[PDB]
Structures are given as structure tokens and as C-alpha cells.
A paper describes a structure:
Aryl-fluorosulfates are mild electrophiles that are very stable in biological media and in vivo and can efficiently react with the side chains of Lys, Tyr, or His residues, when properly juxtaposed by a high-affinity ligand. We report here that a fragment library of aryl-fluorosulfates, when deployed with proper biophysical screening strategies, can identify initial covalent fragments. As a model system to define the most suitable screening approach with our library, we chose the antiapoptotic protein hMcl-1(172–323), given that we recently reported on ligand-first strategies to derive covalent peptide inhibitors targeting active site residues Lys 234, or His 252 with more reactive sulfonyl fluorides, or more recently also His 224 with an aryl-fluorosulfate peptide. The hMcl-1(172–323) construct retained its binding ability for pro-apoptotic proteins and it has been extensively studied to characterize the interaction of hMcl-1 with potential drug candidates. ,,,− Based on our previous experience with covalent agents, we observed that covalent compounds could cause very large denaturation thermal shifts, often with double-digit degrees Celsius, compared to reversible agents.
Finally, the X-ray structure of the complex between fragment hit 2 and hMcl-1(172–323) was also obtained at 1.82 Å resolution, indicating that the compound binds in a deep region within the BH3 binding pocket surrounding His 224. In addition, the contiguous electron density between the compound and His 224 Nε that corresponds to the expected imidazole sulfamate moiety can be clearly observed. Our screening approach resulted in the initial fragment hit 2 whose binding geometry as determined by X-ray crystallography is novel with respect to the several hMcl-1 antagonists reported to date, that almost invariably anchor around an electrostatic interaction with Arg 263 and an acid residue (mimicking a critical Asp acid in the BH3 peptides). The spectral data clearly indicated a large perturbation to the 15Nε and 15Nδ resonances of His 224, compatible with a covalent bond formation at the imidazole ring of His 224. Chemical shift perturbations studies mapping the changes in backbone [15N, 1H] correlations of hMcl-1(172–323) in the presence of fragment hit 2, also revealed that the compound likely binds to the BH3 binding region, closer to His 224 than other binding site nucleophilic residues His 252, or Lys 234. With fragment hit 2, accordingly, which induces the largest ΔT m, hence likely the most effective under the chosen experimental conditions, we observed nearly 100% 1:1 covalent complex formation via MS analysis. Moreover, since reference compound 6 also binds covalently to His 224, we performed a displacement measurement by TSA, and we observed that binding of the covalent hit 2 prevented the binding of the BH3 peptide.
Author numbering: 172 to 321
Write the structure that this text describes.
């Protein structure tokens, strides 16, 4: 509920900022501090994942054939690949969000920017429904920031 709202806030803003290059300075939700720290963390670690795995991201996007809202409302397969062994950690969660940013950039390229928001929902959706129990035990997005603190 609040975990969903916060996760959606963070993932929606990262994907929009990655696709447009413009920071959304409109105010945050109730938990502004945690979400702003999580977004700053994604700007570091998420951008690096895209740089390292650009070829593999291109191949997976090519295999998924994402081009519309229906394709956007169906990020399985990525959920298979990032959690094929079924193990959950913050690095794999980051990699899922990083691929979402990679798809959002492509949606901007083919003039489908309206699909970026439903992309953030389905990624947030499959993340929270599948890993809720794990996300709560790791103290949510504060544990995310503290893990990647550096
Ligand atoms: S990397 O080494 O910087 O980050 C990283 C670490 N371990 C595994 C992965 N996995 C992936 O990038 C895979 C490959 C293609 C793809 C598409 C969507 C989600 C995940 C992945 C990366």
C-alpha cells in the first residue's frame, strides 16, 4: 500500500527522468526524504547497470518486442531472467529497474512516451507483489539506500 505508493513514486520518476533527461521537481509524497535518497542512489547504480549491460538489454528488448501499452503491461520474462534461480537481493532489484529505464528510453525514441507511466506500474506491480515480504524485512527503500550507501 504505502510500500507500493513509495516504490511507484521512485520507479516512475527514475524512468521518466532517464527517458526525458529532465528532472521532475514537483513535490514528493509523504516520505520525501526516503524517496529522494532512493532516486539519488538509482542515478548512481542504475545508470552503471545500463552502461555495462547495454548489449544484453538491447537483446532482451528485441526479444520482448515492446512497442505499446499492451506490451508495456506485461514485464514477465524479465522477471524470469532476473530471478531465474529465485534469489532476491538489491542488485537484482536494481537491474530490473535499470532495464525499465532502458525500455523507457526506447519508448521515448519511438514516440510512445505515454507508455512510460504504465511501464513503471507493471514493474512496481510485479516487484511489490512478488517481493513484498522480502522488501519489508529489508526495511524497504531505506535499506536500499543504506546498502548502496558508499
Ligand atoms: S552488471 O554486472 O553491471 O549488473 C548485473 C549483474 N548481474 C546480473 C545482471 N543481469 C542482466 O543484466 C540481465 C541480462 C539482460 C537483462 C534484461 C533485463 C533484466 C536483467 C537482465 C546484471
Amino acid at each position: 500500500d504505502e510500500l507500493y505508493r513509495q516504490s511507484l513514486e521512485i520507479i516512475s520518476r527514475y524512468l521518466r527522468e532517464q527517458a526525458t533527461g529532465a528532472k521532475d521537481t514537483k513535490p514528493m509524497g509523504r516520505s520525501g526524504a526516503t524517496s529522494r535518497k532512493a532516486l539519488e542512489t538509482l542515478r548512481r547504480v542504475g545508470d552503471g547497470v545500463q552502461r555495462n549491460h547495454e548489449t544484453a538489454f538491447q537483446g532482451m528488448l528485441r526479444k520482448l518486442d515492446i512497442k505499446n501499452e499492451d506490451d508495456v503491461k506485461s514485464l514477465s520474462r524479465v522477471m524470469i531472467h532476473v530471478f531465474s534461480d529465485g534469489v532476491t537481493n538489491w542488485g537484482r532489484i536494481v537491474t530490473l529497474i535499470s532495464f525499465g529505464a532502458f525500455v523507457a528510453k526506447h519508448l521515448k525514441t519511438i514516440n510512445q512516451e505515454s507508455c512510460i507511466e504504465p511501464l513503471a506500474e507493471s514493474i512496481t506491480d510485479v516487484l511489490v507483489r512478488t517481493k513484498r515480504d522480502w522488501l519489508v524485512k529489508q526495511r524497504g527503500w531505506d535499506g536500499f539506500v543504506e546498502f548502496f550507501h558508499v
